[PDB]
Automatic annotation (TrEMBL), chain A:
Native organism: Thermotoga maritima (strain ATCC 43589 / DSM 3109 / JCM 10099 / NBRC 100826 / MSB8)
Database matches in Gene3D superfamilies: 2.40.10.120, Acetamidase/Formamidase-like domains
Protein name, per record: Acetamidase, putative
Binding-site positions, Zn(2+) 1: 138, 140, 165, 174
Record-level Gene Ontology MF annotations: hydrolase activity, acting on carbon-nitrogen (but not peptide) bonds, in linear amides; metal ion binding
Residues at which Zn(2+) 2 binds: 165, 167, 181
Keywords (A to Z) from UniProt: Metal-binding, Zinc
Matches recorded under SUPFAM superfamilies: Acetamidase/Formamidase-like
A Pfam family the protein falls into: FmdA_AmdA
Automatic annotation (TrEMBL), chain B:
Protein name: Acetamidase, putative
Positions contributing to Zn(2+) 1 binding: 136, 138, 163, 172
Residues engaged in binding Zn(2+) 2: 163, 165, 179
UniProt key word Ribonucleoprotein: no
InterPro entries named in the record: FmdA_AmdA (IPR004304)
UniProt source species: Thermotoga maritima (strain ATCC 43589 / DSM 3109 / JCM 10099 / NBRC 100826 / MSB8)
Coiled-coil intervals, chain numbering: none
Gene Ontology terms for molecular function: hydrolase activity, acting on carbon-nitrogen (but not peptide) bonds, in linear amides; metal ion binding
Annotated transmembrane regions: none
Keyword Transferase: no
Length: 275, 273
């Protein structure tokens, strides 16, 4: 099994990044990731070239295993997070990680391992790994855990997949700017699909989560709704207004994070609507 | 033994000066017979003796009884994608015990009360909008077996309640849910703490519920409130509260379609116990 060591990484998803490993689709790959915190740094291991993947494809990354350490780091301070125009100083706290819980002074927060940065090469230019758009990026979506498949739209040959910013746990919003940041080993399985998509999609056992990242949260919310209704309209071949009504009844619109240059909204679309 | 407010006695605004149509003591159960939102009427208001401005009214929702048929609607200028859509459309929905039916799809049932509120401090807010007193919050957590904490601004609170759904998605994106008339049995109590915004208390979580003209403001406010909520209850420094909300609190959306948009923050009880 191929291992991508943490020392091979990027600080931008760039159209022109060079690969540091090549895989056939169907292969498993271990990514060793450094924590996000270490201020010219938020590193994503990779990028990885996947044979035969073309622009307009969908790269599929199944998250098999996230191996976490026993210590984590959270940080906040002036100018950071949702109330950064209201907090002083710069603060950091070490956090103990047990098998089932992150410990926070007296508190046992249920563990919830997740990959916070995941993306591929964009169409043009470069986006820092600290932000996100259609190619993926710093989406801090907690749904990206073990036993899901992240679908990503492809813009460059080979996809050029990179990944990092693993958290031991997090709440939706990530309001202080950070979660429990940790270095990790993430075991993934990479496959391809020839269908084109606009924005990333996380497939869990019972839901599709469409994930939209734009500079203002209101716009991201409008976009993910537009994308959710169409999704349903195409898969069920029903009139748009019916899909719109169906999404009002069964789709849960939400928030991934409110703190990166691009804000991440999501929409849970249950598989029961198709099955 | 036992009080029933019929649906004919209702308001289309939460006003500071609306007259009660019934009175209750804390500890008593009341039944609100509601009409459907399609005018967005709230049965009441009920005067709760012994509740003063500055207190918190606690409304435990015991039962929501639903009919077997519901109504959903949308069209040009309605919902997130009013942009966007042409015409005007309505659809009857069959309601089974465990599911609302939609052209062969079984949407899991999830009974909820969409409008609930009290008299505001001054002026009037239509029952279709929302603010600190409650209103059209369309929060799917306001379900059976939860407690709604509402801030009080007038003597006796003046509680009203309407707009019941059989099921709903967070966001309510086309403007309407599965709209129905219903019976809602509640149990009213009082707390002598002042609060800023409504809070739904579930079995394992508190949900702070903020409603403002734009969702960005709503989201920032629910976050400010949530962090202060945690800071007081645990007597830890603000920055510790802030970090803890980042790890444990789930910020989300109630609805994006009413004139005030409603954000929420889930604060789990385990962080105190
Ligand atoms: Cl509050
Ligand atoms: Zn991140
Ligand atoms: Zn992070
Ligand atoms: Zn409503
Ligand atoms: Zn309604």
């Amino acid at each position: 099994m191929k291992v991508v060591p943490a020392q091979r990484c990027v600080y931008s998803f760039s159209a022109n990044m060079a690969p540091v490993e090549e895989v056939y689709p169907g292969e498993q790959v271990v990514f060793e990731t450094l924590d996000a915190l270490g201020s010219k740094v938020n590193p994503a291991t990779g990028p990885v070239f996947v044979n035969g993947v073309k622009p307009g494809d969908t790269l599929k990354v199944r998250i098999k295993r996230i191996e976490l350490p026993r210590r984590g780091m959270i940080v906040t301070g002036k100018g950071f997070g949702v109330l950064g125009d209201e907090v002083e100083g710069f603060h950091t706290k070490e956090l103990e990680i047990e098998k089932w819980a992150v410990l926070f002074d007296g508190v046992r927060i249920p563990i919830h391992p997740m990959v916070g940065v995941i993306g591929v090469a964009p169409q043009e230019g470069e986006y820092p790994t600290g932000t996100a758009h259609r190619h993926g990026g710093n989406m801090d979506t907690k749904e990206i855990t073990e036993n899901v498949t992240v679908h990503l739209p492809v813009f460059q040959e080979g996809a050029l997949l990179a990944l990092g910013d693993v958290h031991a746990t997090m709440g939706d919003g990530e309001v202080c700017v950070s979660a429990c940041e940790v270095p990790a080993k993430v075991v993934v399985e990479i496959d391809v699909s020839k269908e084109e998509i606009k924005w990333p999609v996380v497939e869990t056992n019972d839901a599709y989560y469409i994930i939209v990242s734009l500079p203002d949260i209101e716009e991201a919310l409008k976009e993910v709704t537009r994308e959710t209704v169409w999704f349903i309209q195409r898969r069920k071949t029903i009139p748009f207004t019916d899909a719109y009504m169906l999404a009002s009844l069964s789709v849960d619109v939400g928030i991934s994070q409110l703190v990166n240059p691009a804000k991440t909204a999501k929409a849970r679309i249950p598989k029961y609507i198709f099955t």
